[PDB]
């Protein structure tokens, strides 16, 4: 009975019908976002693959993050290409829906993994008994990808025939849990920083972790809060008018896609060579 897979294309056509100007504005925003994400993530992938040598677990998590960002960026114009060249065909609307699920899951959890690795390398050096060991980072990335696939299969279904929403158990294990983890980690960092008795380079490392955690928190609260807020309100408040639901859903999807363009602030914290090649590219462009 009208699964979510049908509902995505139906919402696309419905916004194009009811609000043509807003639909075209969102198209322009998506195109600009795709351009910026493509150039930034291509530069990041080149830097993190063909330039850096020390393959720390943070580098592995960041490489998986730029792969996810590149996939979402590639899926961004695929939505409009499928909507125009192959309208009516809703089986071929799968790639951009999968891009939505990848942006919702993999980006969130890889940012969480980067924050966890940064925290564990500051306060508690365990001697790399369980952490570090880049095979462990590869296994964690593989498990995150498998979790994304399992989440997509559980939401959409085996053949995309799952009705209703069933959203309460997703936003807690998908948005509230990483937010809680990052919040408790930045709270621990703030509590450690407030207590006196820290030497200057330790304090510098702690405040750098503070900037990284707060940046990831801002990305979480800007690019992903409206989507889960709409998902909660569509179940707790079904009285809500339909036009408001459609507009809010499309704006939330636009911000969730904006996550791809807003992600590369983390790459400045991950490595030091990113701004170096950015300056090199700027110098090449100037001359």
């Amino acid at each position, epitope marked *: 009975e009208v699964p979510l897979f049908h509902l995505f294309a139906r919402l696309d056509e419905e916004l194009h*019908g009811t609000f043509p100007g807003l639909w*075209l504005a969102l198209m322009a925003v998506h195109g600009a976002i795709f351009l910026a994400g493509l150039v930034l993530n291509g530069l990041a992938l080149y830097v993190f693959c063909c330039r850096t040598r020390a393959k720390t677990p943070s580098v592995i998590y960041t490489i998986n993050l730029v792969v996810t960002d590149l996939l979402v960026g590639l899926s961004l114009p695929t939505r409009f290409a499928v909507y125009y060249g192959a309208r009516g065909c809703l089986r071929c609307a799968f790639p951009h829906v999968l891009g939505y699920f990848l942006n919702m899951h993999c980006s969130i959890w890889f940012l969480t993994c980067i924050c966890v690795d940064r925290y564990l390398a500051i306060v508690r050096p365990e001697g790399s008994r369980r952490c570090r060991q880049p095979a462990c980072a590869r296994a964690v990335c593989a498990f995150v990808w498998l979790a994304a696939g399992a989440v997509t299969l559980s939401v959409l279904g085996v053949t995309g025939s799952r009705p209703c929403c069933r959203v309460f158990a997703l936003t807690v294990l998908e948005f509230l849990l990483p937010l809680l983890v990052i919040s408790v980690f930045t709270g621990r960092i703030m509590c450690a920083l407030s207590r006196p008795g820290l030497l200057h380079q330790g304090r510098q490392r702690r405040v750098r972790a503070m900037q990284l955690l707060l940046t990831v928190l801002i990305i979480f609260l800007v690019c992903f809060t409206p989507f889960h807020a709409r998902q909660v309100a569509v179940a707790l408040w079904p009285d809500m008018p339909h036009h408001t639901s459609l507009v809010v859903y499309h704006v939330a999807v636009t911000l969730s896609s904006l996550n791809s363009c807003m992600n590369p602030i983390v790459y400045c914290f991950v490595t030091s060579g990113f701004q170096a090649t950015v300056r090199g590219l700027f110098g090449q462009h100037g001359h």
Partner: antibody
Amino acid sequence: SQVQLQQSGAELAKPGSSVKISCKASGYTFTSYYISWIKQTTGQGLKYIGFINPGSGHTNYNEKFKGKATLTVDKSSSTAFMQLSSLTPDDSAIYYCARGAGGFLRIITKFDYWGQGVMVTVSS
Amino acid sequence: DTVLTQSPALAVSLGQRVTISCRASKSVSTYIHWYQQRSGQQPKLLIYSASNLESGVPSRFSGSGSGTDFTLTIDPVEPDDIANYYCQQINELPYTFGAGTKLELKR
């Protein structure tokens, strides 16, 4: 063959009952083009009822006809159906199905072909 | 919801130029379809997007205008053009048709 949108014969109904009128498309890929249903009375002019995408199943209705007309699609035989519920002598009119081509700036930018029209007469 | 008001029905003569005026309520850029409802026949699309001829209609028809006022020009006329004419906007979703003009011969 050329594009055609065949329709059923004239229907005489009873007040308070329901009727179903079918528009069978032929000569083109059925799921690639919208099917729109439009009214015409003798006294007034033409009035647009709604449309439906056969592929994605997305439907849109006029505000006046919401809750009165219901649009469905059978893709196996490539036929659109419109159901009138709670018929009243107001609804005695001629109904047309139009093949609306998809557009870029708007959802539909062309209305190429029309059915021959089905006359629905509601009288006790 | 746009309201489209058409010109009153006017008498036409064989061979002379005629025009039909359709005035909208709000602004419709170029989204007026011009049909032709004959006696006991389905409407046949003559003009789409208020300026372009349909593939098949003779070149004697010509649509013009943008914004609020639109015109459809027929020159010359023959007894195949004595029929209804409807202007339909497709800008906003409640598609509104005009009242329709009755062309007829004069004697």
